[model samples]
Target: MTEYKLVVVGAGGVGKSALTIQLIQNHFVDEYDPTIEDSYRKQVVIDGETCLLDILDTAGQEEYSAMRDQYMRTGEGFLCVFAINNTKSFEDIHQYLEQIKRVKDSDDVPMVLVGNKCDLAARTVESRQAQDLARSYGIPYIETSAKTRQGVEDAFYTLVREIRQH
Candidate 1:
């Protein structure tokens, strides 16, 4: 079976942990805890092809910045997440993308720009803005709501498909 490593990254409290938990466990978590690091494994079928997915849920704190390069280097696919309600988090997406490119030493690495927390009514980052940024990077853009379980699967599946093609 094919195997792939996926990493989830973004500013703190941007719902990276929430999204990863929802995708892997099929449940939504209400509390936010700053993550140091966490890993999850699952066997999934995509387009009738089966693969083992290894997910690294990363800490978004500045103190954890030193470990990001290691995650970027090891990850085959990346989900660059940001809270739709937080403009500051959205602005930091570029740095995450740049880090991935630098660590992988390639701009063509498989990645997706994720605007999470779509379930909330108040949002600072519009869908169009996120889409425009993803377009500039030539990557897919997706909006997900971990609370409602919307687009969570699509985000992971899309990244895995891109990784397979990469």
Candidate 2:
């Protein structure tokens, strides 16, 4: 089976852990400990194609910054997650992308910008702005809700397709 290493990143409370859990288990936790650094492996089928997706969900705490960078550098693809309810997270995506570029040493690496927590539309940060930023960076972007399983599978499939094509 083909293997895809993915790094999910963003500021604290941006839903990286929740996204990872939903992707692997098809469910989300109400309250998760953000201090735990974890990586998980799962197999997923996308568009009738199956692949091993190894996801590294790093600790969002400030002290784990170095480990997060290391994880980002070695991954095959990146899922830069931001909370749709947090405007600041939506704005800080640029820094994450820049870090990915520098650490991976390749501007051509594939990435999918994720505006997570879309289930909370009432508290949405600026969806259009996040999408526009992703477009400007040449990265495909989508809104996802781990709770509803919305766009979670598509994000992985789309990024993999892009990587295979390019």
Candidate 3:
């Protein structure tokens, strides 16, 4: 089986933990507490191939800034998550992307730009804007709702595919 290390990063309360729980545990936690750092391992099948996924769900709070580089250094693929309802979180994507590139020592690292909380009715960031940003970075962009479980699987599968191809 192929093995890949995936890291999830975003601003506080942007649904990074929610998305990770939905993917690995198939459940959602409605409450938000700042995550320090956590890792999960799961066996997932993508396109008929079984693979081992080591996922690092990083804290989005600024207090965790010192540890972000450590997580970035270990990831083979990254999921830069942001909420559509939080425009500030969306704006922070550039910083996360640049950090990944700097830590990985390559601008061509495998990554996917994920816009979570698509179930929200009050969206500040438009899909076109997110798509355009991802396009400029040459990464795949996807929107997911952990509440309704829409596009959750696709996001993980897409990142794994990108990791394989890269």
Candidate 4:
């Protein structure tokens, strides 16, 4: 089998890449800058079977946003994330959901709803809304903090397992 492809999608400064790198590098990167659209690959063993996760970190800013159609076609799973403190970023999740469904031409896809920046005490998007939205869509919702390394692996690994969907 080929390597599993997971696409990380979200608005700018939502720590999309941070989660990917945190899972790979074993440390939280404090570089709170807009991503430059990078792709990464890491090997991991799931249930005694070794596999590779090929992940793409995309930019959210219009000027830097990567082409969606290209990876959307081949991406196996998606991590749709947002910063909990930014309501605008939270709202943008709806767009990505619709777009991913449109491109994949399926109602159900391997994806995860991630609420990031939970380490920040001040929150804009409440917990219930995120849970409700994820429930409505029948997707797994996880709260994470790249700074504290909280829920990062659970979030990413959930999406990875979704690809198999047993």
Best by lDDT: 1
TM-score of 1: 0.97
Question: By descending lDDT, how would the candidates be arranged?
Answer: 1, 3, 4, 2
Order of candidate numbers by TM-score, starting with the best: 1, 3, 4, 2
lDDT preference between candidates 1 and 3, better one: 1
Better of 1 and 2 by TM-score: 1
Off by over 4 Å in 3: none
Per-residue lDDT of model 1, residues 1-166, tens digit only: 9998999999999999999999999999998588999999999888999889999999889777678888888899999999999999999988999888988999799999999999999999889999999998899999999999999999999999899988
Give candidate 3's root-mean-square deviation (CA, Å).
0.9
Cα lDDT of model 2 by residue, 6-114, tens digit: 7787888888888888878879877957746677988778668888888788766667678867787688888888888888887777788998898888888899999
Candidate 4 CA-lDDT value: 0.87
C-alpha lDDT score of every prediction, in listed order: 0.92, 0.81, 0.90, 0.87
Shift of residue 46 alpha carbon in model 1, Å: 1.2
* Residue ranges of candidate 4 with Cα displaced over 4 Å: 63-66
Give lDDT tens digits, candidate 3, residues 42-153. Answer: 9978889899999998888887776988888888999999999999999998799988998889979899999999999999999999999898889999999988889999
Alpha-carbon runs more than 4 Å astray in model 1: none
Residue 98 miss distance in model 4 (angstroms): 0.4
Q: Which segments of candidate 2 are over 4 A away from where they belong?
A: none
Name the weakest run of 10 consecutive residues (lDDT summed) in model 4: 61-70
**Cα TM-score of candidate 4:** 0.94
- Number of the top TM-score candidate: 1
TM-score of each: 0.97, 0.91, 0.96, 0.94
